[PDB]
Amino acid sequence: LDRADILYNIRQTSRPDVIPTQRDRPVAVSVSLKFINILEVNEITNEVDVVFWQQTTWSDRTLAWNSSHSPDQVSVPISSLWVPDLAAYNAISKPEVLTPQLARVVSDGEVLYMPSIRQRFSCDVSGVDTESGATCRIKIGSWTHHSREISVDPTSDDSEYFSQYSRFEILDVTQKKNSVTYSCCPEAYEDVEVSLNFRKKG
Amino acid sequence: LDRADILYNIRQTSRPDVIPTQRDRPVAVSVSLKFINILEVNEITNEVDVVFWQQTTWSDRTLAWNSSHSPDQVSVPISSLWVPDLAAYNAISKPEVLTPQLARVVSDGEVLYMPSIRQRFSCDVSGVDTESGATCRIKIGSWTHHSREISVDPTDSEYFSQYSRFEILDVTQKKNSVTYSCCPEAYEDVEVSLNFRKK
Amino acid sequence: LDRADILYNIRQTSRPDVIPTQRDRPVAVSVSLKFINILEVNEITNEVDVVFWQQTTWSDRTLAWNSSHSPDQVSVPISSLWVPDLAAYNAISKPEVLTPQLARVVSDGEVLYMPSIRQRFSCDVSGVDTESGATCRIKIGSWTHHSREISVDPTSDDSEYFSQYSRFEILDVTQKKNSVTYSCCPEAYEDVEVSLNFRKKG
Amino acid sequence: LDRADILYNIRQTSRPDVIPTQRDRPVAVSVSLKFINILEVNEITNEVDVVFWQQTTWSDRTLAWNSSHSPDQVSVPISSLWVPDLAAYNAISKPEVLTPQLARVVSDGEVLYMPSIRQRFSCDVSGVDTESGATCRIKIGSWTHHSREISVDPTTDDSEYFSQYSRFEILDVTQKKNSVTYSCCPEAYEDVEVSLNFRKK
Amino acid sequence: LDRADILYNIRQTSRPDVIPTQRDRPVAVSVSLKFINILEVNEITNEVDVVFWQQTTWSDRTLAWNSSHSPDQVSVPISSLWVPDLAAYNAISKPEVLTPQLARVVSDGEVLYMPSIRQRFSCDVSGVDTESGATCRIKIGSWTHHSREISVDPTTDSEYFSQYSRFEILDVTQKKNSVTYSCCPEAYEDVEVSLNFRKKG
Ligand SMILES: OC1(c2ccc(Cl)cc2)CCNCC1
Ligand SMILES: [Cl-]
Ligand SMILES: [Cl-]
Ligand SMILES: [Cl-]
Ligand SMILES: [Cl-]
Ligand SMILES: [Cl-]
């Protein structure tokens, strides 16, 4: 197969509306935030404007092809793929996607989608101008798929991609798995809670 | 049936333009606002910027499937479904939808659509910096469907951000049904009274 | 007929690009503005930011159906209908439509379209902080259809739907029929001139 | 023919991607800006926010019909027509189109497209608060079509449509045709340079 | 062939989803920024708002046609072409494209795409109000295609820069880099554009 054939096959048989569950197990989605910038912070309103790369991976076996005498990977527009319906629970703006909306598909059906996103959050900005800094928690999970359909799991240097030119610096990033069960319903919705410990540079 | 078959069937036979009335009874739409944040308040202009989850439920029997050896529920893009034409009467900005535009469809044809919306409203901000607080009333109803086509009923502060400059004292919901001088028909709305104050 | 059949028939046959002229007479469009709010006024720049319901009615006989044992009216997306190409001649922002873009179609082919619009205008803001108030004139008519193709005519209490919470109050609204000729072309374009007499409550 | 037939024919045979050149001669595009308002001016940054009607005309013979016992003109969505790829070279915002995106098509294939546009420009705001005023020059031409494919010409009262309520007033509007060879490409690109001489009241 | 036939053929066969690699060599993409304006600078936040023409060229042999008794070039909507998935690594706003989204396709399959973009960047604004000025570095490369799939090269400063900017350009250098990230084995090529500029005195 060449790239043309693989991309034709994916475009022609793409069920972007269909979660690729295998044998009634959840789709395992990995999410890791790489912080790139902290642009605007307001300690009065507890609001932050952040840029991050959202490293997102999952398997869709319907995409897989025999890689013998074929490309190992192709770039696919996300409009031709099922993508997890991830939302930031404490976002106060729509995600501004700064990058081309393409994912990488490996011949085994692994998908890697890593958009650069600028987004505003409601989180704890208290202590931002102190030595110990602020801890801003960002929660990202499936909007409509509970734990039997989508599982979310966290997956380098926290500041490896962070802009040296930000007014802020990163002290620590932790990414941990949470679940919310709401009063209305019995099902749990999984999220990654990303704790961004940062401060204003002196 | 698997998810692929159910979602194919819905996509292929979706009449998103067709209100799913049964036996000439109105479609019963439930609306409950879960307040998440109060972001900007202006007591001079009487304007508020609010984030809420708009819990919206109704039945569309045309979506229903036999759930024996099948999923009980699927996630469906709202572009493939009829959705009530709800509007906030006192909104002064278009709703900014912060979440994926998917609904949950249950095998009995129940639809649950719960977008996170940021929107600006014209309401009473007077008293926001006092102990008793402000009461901001938000009215939501069908823009074009009268009471014989759509009924709206209330089904709320539990998921409010601890980091807001504001706090919720109380949320009350009433149903209103208004017949205007021009027309014979009644228009239903849910009136949500948000009593909040600066911390 | 049921709603499903009527909406199918309209979607299949509507011709949204085709002005429904009868025997080469103009399409009679009625326009009435119901003011809902006055949000921002600037007496220096002579600019106002207003919210209004634009009550718009006309007949399209191609939409009509036999109402015996059928609904008298349906809700139709405006993308499935011909709609008059109305513009505010003194608008300085695009109309922000706040409401679902649906019209009501009666079985005789009468259409009622009433969007809630927020829009900014260039008009006379002088006297806004006085007892007599400002008179801000808004002109609305067809962008491309002259008087032989579209006629515009004005169609309750002026303040009936006006927000009690506005910094402003309405003293009077008058709506009258005008015509504009541009220097380039011989034809007249009909408009409704809406005079909004309002003042600061102070 | 009635309007329904003409609009069906245009919609069914519309090649909006295809420049309607005749025998490898350029498409003659006429462009005239009618200024409606000057909303924000900044003499520090040399930026202006303007509203104008962009009167745009050209011929597309593929649209033409026999007008005997037929309408002489129809309103057509620009999504069903080829439109010149005009750009303002010194625009610093996207054109905000305020009006329905319809053009007039005459039975001979003449197209008239006149959107109301709000747009921000980088131009000379110096002297805006003086008697002689500022001269803000706006250059509009085809982004991708050189002079053998598109020619641009100014059309053959400057304040006739200008808002009486603007903080500003128009002293003069002049339009001149330029034909410029840029470093990237060997071909010449035509533009209309519109000089807006205006001042604060 | 006429333009209508060429544009039909391209629309029917272009494969916009398919990188036009030849014999498993990378697609050679050339990128050069022509700075048009510097609109807003903030030395406190280290943010700049810039307008530039992004001159972008590559070959797609699947677009080629016999140019004998045919146009040498056509204007094609980029939605009908494969375009490199270029991103500015230090952009903090989405690119605001100010120009019609058309590329030029030559009969040999060479593509020229040159949008005017307004975009905000995180870069070194320190020294902007001094004689030596600030040096703001902008890195542009393929978001998803590593060096075996896409190579990025500069073509070899103030020619199109607005005389009305509050700022002036002292120097522009454009040089080729390769970045390997810790997670993954492949290198991604980028053009690093160093914009040395200052406030006019
Ligand atoms: O459906 C969700 C929900 C949240 C809160 C309440 Cl009170 C009810 C339902 C849970 C899944 N994510 C979207 C919202
Ligand atoms: Cl690829
Ligand atoms: Cl599902
Ligand atoms: Cl209906
Ligand atoms: Cl017409
Ligand atoms: Cl061409």
Numbering used by the authors:
A (entry chain D), C (entry chain A): 20 to 174, 178 to 224
B (entry chain E): 20 to 174, 180 to 223
D (entry chain B): 20 to 175, 179 to 223
E (entry chain C): 20 to 175, 180 to 224
Give verbatim lines from the article:
AChBPs are homopentameric, water-soluble homologs of the ligand-binding domain of LGICs and well-established structural surrogates for nicotinic acetylcholine receptors (nAChR). Importantly, AChBPs can bind nAChR-specific ligands and induce similar conformational changes as in the membrane bound receptors. LGICs are activated by ligands binding at subunit interfaces of their extracellular domains, thereby inducing conformational changes that affect the structure of a central pore and its ability to transport ions through the membrane. Additional density was found in all structures at the interface between the subunits in the orthosteric agonist and antagonist binding site, next to loop C in which the respective ligands could be modelled.
In total, five structures of Ls-AChBP in complex with a ligand were successfully solved. The unit cell was comprised of two or four pentamers of Ls-AChBP in the presence of FL1613, FL1856, FL1888, FL3044, VUF24234 and VUF6105. However, the number of binding sites in which additional electron density was observed varied. The electron density in the binding site region was generally poor, indicating that compounds may have had several binding modes in the site. A computational alignment and superimposition of AChBP taken from the protein–ligand complexes and the apo structure showed that there were no large global conformational changes in any of the structures upon ligand binding. However, there were small changes in the loop C region of the crystal structures of Ls-AChBP. Notably, binding of FL1888, VUF24234 and VUF6105 results in a movement of the loop closer to the compound, while binding of FL1856, FL3044, FL1613 and FL1909 does not have the same effect.
